């Protein structure tokens, strides 16, 4: 409880298959008209959930991948491009490698999650919704 303003600004991408999220270079940053070209850079972080299965043993639900602007969120201190499990990096041409403190993260008590939209022509990877 008590998440504060630590949520992703966007809804998650759900992984229905067995391959990690990835995008072609230059692709994958969610659309956000309240941001500038230098802002268009960040990471998706895999969030796992467990539930009790019908047989009484714990079970994984499908992973969900949440976008955070560079320098914000749970991996705020992680450098762009660092190889870290559960983290994948995306940037649009025109991005700058600077932390996006001015955008930050979302307080769900004050703002709903922006439906995650990618520009027309983005390669959406297999098994992702």
């Amino acid at each position, epitope marked *: 409880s008590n998440m504060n303003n630590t949520a992703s600004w966007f809804t998650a991408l759900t992984q229905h298959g067995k391959e990690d999220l990835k995008f072609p270079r230059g692709q994958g940053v969610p659309i956000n008209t309240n941001s*500038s*070209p*230098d802002d268009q850079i960040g990471y998706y972080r895999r969030a796992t959930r467990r539930i009790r299965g019908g047989d009484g043993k714990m079970k994984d639900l499908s992973p969900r991948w949440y976008f955070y602007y560079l320098g914000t969120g749970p991996e705020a201190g992680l450098p*762009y491009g660092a190889n870290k499990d559960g983290i994948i990096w995306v940037a649009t041409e025109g991005a*700058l*490698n600077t932390p996006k403190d001015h955008i930050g993260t979302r307080n769900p008590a004050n703002n709903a999650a922006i439906v995650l939209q990618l520009p027309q022509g983005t390669t959406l990877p297999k098994g992702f919704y």
Partner: antibody
Amino acid sequence: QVQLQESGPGLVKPSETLSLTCTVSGGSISSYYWSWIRQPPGKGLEWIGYIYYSGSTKYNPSLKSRVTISVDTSKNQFSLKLTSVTAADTAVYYCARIYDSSGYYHPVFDYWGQGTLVTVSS
Amino acid sequence: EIVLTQSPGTLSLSPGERATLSCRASQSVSSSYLAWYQQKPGQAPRLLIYGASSRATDIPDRFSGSGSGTDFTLTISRLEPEDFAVYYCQQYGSSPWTFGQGTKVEIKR
């Protein structure tokens, strides 16, 4: 090879407007960020602002009320306008390109002009 | 703004010595938002290190950057007379981008 060159008056009266132009040769303005940085005589460096080739800008908040950076792709130039100058604005003004050849988007100044001194004086 | 304080203000060392330059920030700039520039008299600055610890490609590996948060170091091994310069750190972890006031490295003879 990419070369930058500042031009403009070396002497400006107090309260008037300082204007400089950077001319780029051996490469295009297009696709890059461009920046102005200044250095008062005997002192350190101060970042003024940048402009992306397609027009978006970001300025140092302490100068924002007085600064305009503009870009002219047709002439392969970008420019600086600084209003209401005082002796605190006397400095060598550098233009620079921002570009990270490693592909990791770092805002590093990879090519610089030679600098042009502007003295604010009556 | 984030203020960068460089220490010492001047350094005087013999060729072949190892030089240690300090840059300390007033607020954290994480681990990849710091650059170092070298400035010789009459010249524009020149990129040495970026991303706190990544070295520019035309710079030899006797230059190295380290640190994180607020505490950063530039190390120059095998100092040379041509290493006389003012060395500036610069942060881009916060707007506005800001420079330290420099450490001038004098070569002893």
